Amino acid sequence: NANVVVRLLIRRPECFGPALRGEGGNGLLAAMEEAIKIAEDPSRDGPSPEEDDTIHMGNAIMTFYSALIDLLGRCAPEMHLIHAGKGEAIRIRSILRSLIPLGDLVGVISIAFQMPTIAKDGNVVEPDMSAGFCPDHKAAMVLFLDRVYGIEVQDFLLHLLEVGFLPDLRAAASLDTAALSATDMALALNRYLCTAVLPLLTRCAPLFAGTEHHASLIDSLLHTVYRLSKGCSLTKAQRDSIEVCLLSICGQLRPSMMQHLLRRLVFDVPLLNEHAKMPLKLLTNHYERCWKYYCLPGGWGNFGAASEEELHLSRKLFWGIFDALSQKKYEQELFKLALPCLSAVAGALPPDYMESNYVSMMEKQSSMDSEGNFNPQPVDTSNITIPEKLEYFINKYAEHSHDKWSMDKLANGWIYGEIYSDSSKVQPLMKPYKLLSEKEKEIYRWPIKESLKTMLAWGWRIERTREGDSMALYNGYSPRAIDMSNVTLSRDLHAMAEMMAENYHNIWAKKKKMELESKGGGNHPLLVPYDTLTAKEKAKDREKAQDILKFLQINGYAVSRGFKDLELDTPSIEKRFAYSFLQQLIRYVDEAHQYILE
Amino acid sequence: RDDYDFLMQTSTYYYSVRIFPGQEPANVWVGWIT
Amino acid sequence: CSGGHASNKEKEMVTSLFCKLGVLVRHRISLFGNDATSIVNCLHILGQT
Amino acid sequence: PGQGRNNNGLEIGCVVDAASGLLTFIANGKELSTYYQVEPSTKLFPAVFAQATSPNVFQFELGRIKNVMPLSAGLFKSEHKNPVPQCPPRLHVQFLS
Amino acid sequence: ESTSNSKNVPPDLSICTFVLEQSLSVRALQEMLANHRTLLYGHAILLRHSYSGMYLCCLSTSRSSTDKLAFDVGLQEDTTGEACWWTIHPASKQRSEGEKVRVGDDLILVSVSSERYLHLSYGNGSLHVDAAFQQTLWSVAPISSGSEAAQGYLIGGDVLRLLHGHMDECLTVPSGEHGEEQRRTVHYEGGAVSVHARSLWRLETLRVAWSGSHIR
């Protein structure tokens, strides 16, 4: 019945609409563009003086092209026949694959939705979904992508992910509040992302194997699944589906990328609430799939071994979970889950794991909160003042900023004049930074001073190397621009740059939460924590961290960590995981013997 | 301009190495070996 | 030979745990409902260590 | 000059006199104090040693300076009298392995 | 190629000719893909280009002539696959499937590979030809039949030499002096010109149909 419908529907191309007919039509992605403007134009979406008396033609054109393609995707042959080599099936799929271009499908998946807004009154101003772009209008896209084109290669897979799904999986994160949990946007987007998108990612799970070199989006899809999985309006079947998708995805990646997710887990799992069951399965299956990585000193031959940070996180996780169950209440299913979990964490942790005395300082308590879920606390910076010996570096990076600035205006085309007119594009400032005034130096001074006090807040020991002392001793225009074409920073220093950029993102999130208080609420799609952002959206933190800490070394100052280790009792055979585990077990069994003796 | 007699009679040769800005010059050695 | 030296004190705690688990299992098969199998397996496997 | 090289990467010119054996070096347009006096008939290979702390490490610019004959003129007998720098395909970078 | 202004501009009927190589049934084409006949409506035909020796096929590629659904029509070396095969169908009601095609019938051709009509596209200022979903009536005109040809006799569209004098001379234009104005003259010449390519002439009749017939 499909090989007849397809053959009948192509002979009459008038059934495809005025945009997919073939002549003059703008396509399907460009047909998803006039309809999303009719829904806002009141002169073309109404009878021109809800749906029963006012038929929305913005909601009527894109529901037509979401049913035509849903039929054109449901007429696709089942793929076992394509595997067996059925000629007519391959021909039908090729006709179906040529009717609709792949780029005309990826763009429609990438189209953003309209989110409800909270008002000054405190009521949710939710736009009409009987009038605007529906989450079910993007669901036929996912069916066509799976049945006709197919997702068979890793690069197209994470391309489509990055461009269409994350922007849609982060629009349900802002809907995870109390008021927005029961919106029809929530009820429809949760349905879409739990019946079409996540099940597709479950079927495309094996294609997530060789994607180490993309680390910022597979450490963000995990977060945009896990933290949305704590939603309250989520149904039983939808919760089961997201659980299945989550362990299916985490069952393919290398252990290195499951670090941000483990950091997220090690604070939420110990609570041992109802939600904790699926994180428990996640951690369990992770620790059986990758156990030599953490237990065997060399680990997997290709994947490697732990970096001692995952090793200390696993120890604190095991101990917190063990104590928490020690103080919990009896429940069959809870222990039937948790006993394999602890038995796997202990079995993957080295039995002789050396408890480093350097417990992680400044362990974050900022973003892993429950209510409001965002508490920015950058460490106080005003309490520490930049030394005047660093004022020379402040001035140097001020000229460096002025030189980025100047290359930008040589690009733009600013012309010499005596007045600052934004209309005529004239500004007197092609003078060097020496001729600038202090206040227009301060549009550079404030960023530099705040950046330096940011690293000073933690006590980062900034030390001038003798090369900078030499710089102090060395003490119709020819410009010159600094060329940082080869500068590269080290691995541990790059990891430190990661967290200081996380602090500069924490400040950004703090400022936009104060201005969100002025907005009266409404979670921005990019206001999610640093670990939830993707590579492209993690751009300003990267540029700021990189240029500041690659210019610091090229000027001479050597920066170190906040302070130096208090002590290391390496000869202590009383500090391995075995010591703590065995005395804890012996204490508990000493108790249990007391109880049994009574 | 170089003299086209001294240039024709000289036996002095040249090559130059540009250490790229960002590569540490403390880890780069330039010269001749046998 | 790849490593994993449990200290003499660690072996001391292992032996003490074995002995004390034996004292726990002494004449309390009924009190430990149907898990006396678990205790005897524990004593088997740690006695073997 | 110290520290700041991001004006332009360090240009270390290597000058060899194949008639006297004097090996001089010019860095950033200034002659360096170090010099070598090789024996007659010594065959010298232009070499650069580097530990890579950058995506792009160094380069083998084969140009010329004032009053000095390009490298290809000494490398190749056919181009002995050509003052124009050349990099014929026979000249390629090697490494110790 | 235009064949309506033949009284003013001769048509190049040397590259417009095709040979009906094979006429198999749809099912027989299916099996022979999986592993003198009179044409009947509904069969699958293989068309071989006379000049090039290649086969008409759907190219599975578009020139993007304002139609996103159309494919270009061209020539292919091999005969394998279903791209080189076309199905002939009745155009009007007087004919039907299974009935043998007449020499004066209009035909519609559908590619087996793409299920697209051999379409005349008015899309641009120039007139295109492609595989689209809109049908175009094609009239098959007979040029020649190999079986009825006679060896040693002049037929239409033959490349030949005009041996004038004593089997020695050849009616030939001058050689390659790099000047076409000087080459635009005609004379008799002998020797090694009888095996060269500048003494070769094509005899084209003043007809479009049956242009490969015996010259009278």
In E, minimum Cα distance to A101 occurs at: E68
DSSP states of E122-188 as a string?
-SSSSPEEEEESS---EE------TTT--TTS-BSSEEE----SSSSEEEE-----S-HHHHT--EE
**Residue E23, token pair as written in the block:** 């006429």
**CA–CA gap between residue E143 and residue E154 (Å, rounded):** 15
Chains touching chain B through at least 3 C-beta pairs below 8 angstroms are A, D
CB under 8 A, 24+ apart: contacts of A112-116: A112/A167, A112/A168, A112/A171, A113/A168, A113/A171, A113/A185, A113/A189, A115/A171, A115/A174, A115/A175, A115/A185, A115/A522, A116/A175, A116/A180, A116/A183, A116/A185
Query: A91 contacts in E (CB within 8 Å)?
Result: 82, 113-115
The angle at the Cα of C5, spanning C1 to C7, to the nearest 5 degrees, equals 160
In terms of Cα–Cα distance, which of A495, A257, A499, A271 is closest to A363? A499
Q: Report how far apart, in Å, the C-alpha atoms of A71 and of each of A64, A77, A539 are.
A: 11, 12, 41
Q: Smallest Cβ distance to D4: which of A471, A485, A487?
A: A471
> Is the CB of B15 less than 8 angstroms away from the CB of D61?
yes
DSSP A225-250: HHTGGG-SS--HHHHHHHHHHHHHHH
CA atoms within 13 A on the CB side of A436: 22
Contact A489, A497 (CB under 8 A): yes
Amino acid letter for position A96:
L
In chain B, whose CA is at the least distance from the CA of D63? B15
D33/chain A closest Cα distance in angstroms = 20
**Contact partners, residue A248, CB within 8 Å, separation at least 6:** A201, A202, A205
Number of Cβ atoms within 10 Å of the Cβ of A143 = 17
* CA dist list (Å): A410 to A270, A420, A434, A435, A444: 56, 17, 18, 18, 19
- List the determination method: cryo-EM
Residue ranges of E strands in A38-119: 117-118
Q: Which residues contact A434 (CB under 8 A, 6 or more apart)?
A: none
Of the candidates A183, A309, A323, the one whose C-alpha atom is nearest the C-alpha of residue A258 is A309
Cβ atoms D21, D40 nearer than 8 A:
yes
Task: Select the residue of A13, A27, A94 nearest E133 (Cβ to Cβ).
Answer: A13
Residue A64 and residue A70: Cα distance in Å, rounded? 10
Closest partner residue to B13 among D12, D50, D69, by Cβ?
D69
Burial level of B17, CB count in 10 A (0-12/13-18/19+)? buried
Is the Cβ pair A483, B23 closer than 8 Å? no
Data resolution in angstroms: 3.1
Select the residue from A395, A403, A486, A552 to test the D interface by mutation, using most D Cβ atoms within 10 A: A486
The angle, 0 to 180 degrees and rounded to 10, between the axes of the packed helices A540-555 and A391-412 is 130
The letter for the amino acid at A132 is G
D17 vs B contacts (CB less than 8 Å)? 11-12
Helices (H) and strands (E) in chain B, counts: 1, 2
Q: How many CA atoms lie within 13 A of A222 on its CB side?
A: 25
Angle at A193 between CA A188 and CA A196, to 5 degrees: 105
Q: How many Å apart are CA C42 and CA A322, to the nearest integer?
A: 19
Sequence-ordered list of residues with C-beta below 8 angstroms from that of A221, at least 6 positions apart, any chain: A161, A165, A166, A169, A249
Task: Collect all residues with Cβ–Cβ distance below 8 Å to E160 and sequence separation of at least 6.
Answer: E154, E200, E201, E203
In the numeric block, the tokens 């004049």 are attached to A417
**Contact criterion met (CB below 8 Å) for A22 and E130:** no
DSSP B12: E
Q: H helices within chain C, ranges in order?
A: 8-25, 36-47
Using alpha carbons, list the distances in angstroms from residue A43 to A17, A49, A53, A127.
Answer: 22, 9, 15, 18
Is B20 within 8 Å of A488 when comparing Cβ atoms?
A: no
